[PDB]
C-alpha cells in the first residue's frame, strides 16, 4: 500500500479540495467518499485530495498519496 512518499496524484478530485487536520483526517474523508479510491494528502499545505479514476503520479516533495485503506 502507498502512503508516505513524494508522489502526488494528478487526477481529478471528487469535490472541493479542503484541508485536513492530518493524514488520517484525509483518510477518514476518503472513507466517506465512495468514489475516493485514493487520497493525496499534501503535507506541504495540509490539503486533502479525495480523488477518483486513474492516478497520475508525479514527483513532488510534499504530496503523499494513500491507497485509501491500509
Ligand atoms: C502545489 C503544486 O503546484 N502542485 C502541482 C500539481 O497541482 C496540484 O497539486 C496538488 C497538490 O500538490 C494536487 O495534486 C492537485 O490535484 C494538483 O492539480 C500539478 O498537477 C503537478 C503536475 O506535475 O505539479 C505540482 O507541482
**SS3 per residue for the chain:** CCCCCCEEECCCECCCCCECCCHHHHHHHHHHCCCCCEEEEECCCCECCEECCCCCEEECCCEEEECCCC
For position 31, which CATH number holds?
3.50.4.10
Alpha carbon separation from 20 to 24, 27, 28, 54 (Å, rounded) = 9, 9, 10, 23
> Best of 5, 7, 9, 10 to mutate for ligand 1, by most ligand atoms within 8 A of CB?
10
Structural domain span for residue 63: 1-70
Report CA(11)–ligand 1 centroid distance (Å): 9
- Ligand 1: atom nearest CA of 47 is 11
| Count of the separate structural domains present in the chain | 1
The residue whose CA has the least distance to atom 11 of ligand 1 is 42
Closest CA to 9 of 61, 46, 63, 62: 63
Amino acid at each position: 500500500c502507498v502512503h508516505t512518499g513524494n508522489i502526488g496524484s494528478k487526477a481529478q478530485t471528487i469535490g472541493e479540495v479542503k484541508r485536513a487536520s492530518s493524514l488520517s483526517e484525509c483518510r477518514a474523508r476518503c472513507q466517506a467518499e465512495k468514489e475516493c479510491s485514493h487520497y493525496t494528502y499534501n503535507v506541504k499545505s495540509g490539503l486533502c485530495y479525495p480523488k477518483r479514476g486513474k492516478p497520475q503520479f508525479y514527483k513532488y516533495l510534499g504530496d503523499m498519496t494513500g491507497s485509501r485503506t491500509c
